[PDB]
Design a binder for this molecule. Structure first.
Ligand code: NI
Ligand code: NI
Ligand code: NI
Ligand code: NI
Ligand code: NI
Ligand code: NI
Lengths: 131, 134, 134, 131
């Protein structure tokens, strides 16, 4: 049977979801999101994997870089390298190359991802046996 | 502004959905957020135009002509490489993160072409859309 | 075109010069080449104008406000940061290579200012001049 | 007493030396170079040091990146990280962050520095006790 739950979205993502509802001919948020979920629905251990986090963050946010460096230092992952460029005057893009287990990597991602001024932290993992 | 809205779903699917919240570090609201972002970015990349992405490649530097080949592909693709970081992982494996600017076709093509080369063991693209950061 | 020319020198100084050829990996011609390049770059940086350099900094990330401080200094300097790479060396020490574009004053000032901060253990600039690469 | 030896310079460096002779009021190559040497003249061991090579190289030179990667891989130094950007359409700039002893580091520098298409390879070293 049919059940109704609540989702919370940041404005920028909501606006885009609303535009996609219109461009693609959906009738509601509920309907498109349902179709997305249904489509998605179609892991974690102690092994060391190499990973990459791609982080876009707000340039004007004070102390953000410091907070990221501290987290990287505090992490139980081994961060090999961080590289930063400016995309525009509002945004910087960073790649973090790191080694750790699935739990350590996921924690880093969510920690960085939840900081104010971080637009996203997207993860790429490669396990030994897939290279 | 985080905005609350409700979604309606069949219990059998809400149970499958809810089976993955903690597995993936998160509330239900957080896992669906990530699903939505992913699909909206895919959709954006499928349509209409200067995009940012990161290509992650793991490759064997012993393949004689591979790096120059990757460079030639990228030059002919029309994409701009903003920056590249390379880690010499071990005797064979190099990992690179290549920060790319261009049209979504050009960028996705560069990925496909590079992933097909002998010596390339891994090639995965991270896409970004301007609605995520403007 | 490598061009041969001769130089004249007092033996006591040619002996000191020649004492350092092998010590530094090189013929006499190679060690003097490097000396000349260095002085010519210094001279170029002293005069008259968009320059490229790399700043290398080793610093303690436990100094509370240091990274933001470095960022504020750099923003107020007028220099453009093209790219930054950071290595988390150990519990305290971070090494960064900061690729800079700007006037030689601005860039040299940024170095001096950063080298004076508590927590900064090392700050050394690599200068380039357009005669080296145009 | 006074002795006469030969130096060989790449054209771009010779041209610049000639311009400096004129701008600063020197009378000869021999005289300015002598004054440079005299000014300069006013080390290597097995300890691990952290170092950085800053390399500017010709973008159009084919197989150069490959040759650099191979050298970095073959080196007895531990190369932590390489980062590359384009300066212009003719030049790229790379930083190599590495650990090794003085002999290993110097060899890497000269190996990379002697490749066709490399405009320079400039070294920065920091020993443990100087940080
Ligand atoms: Ni290129
Ligand atoms: Ni490599
Ligand atoms: Ni190898
Ligand atoms: Ni900035
Ligand atoms: Ni650090
Ligand atoms: Ni620490």
């Amino acid at each position: 049977s049919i059940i109704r739950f609540s989702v919370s979205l940041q404005q920028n993502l909501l606006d885009e979801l609303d535009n996609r509802i219109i461009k693609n001919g959906y009738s509601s948020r509920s309907e498109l999101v349902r179709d997305m979920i249904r489509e998605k629905l179609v892991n974690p251990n102690d092994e060391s994997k190499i990973a990459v986090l791609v982080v876009i963050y707000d340039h004007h946010q004070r102390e953000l870089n410091q907070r990221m460096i501290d987290i990287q230092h505090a992490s139980g992952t081994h961060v090999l390298c961080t590289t930063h460029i400016h995309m525009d005057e509002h945004n910087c893009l960073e790649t973090i190359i790191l080694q750790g287990n699935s739990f350590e990597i996921q924690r880093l991602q969510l920690e960085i991802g939840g900081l104010r001024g971080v637009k996203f932290a997207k993860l790429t993992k490669a396990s030994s046996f897939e290279y």
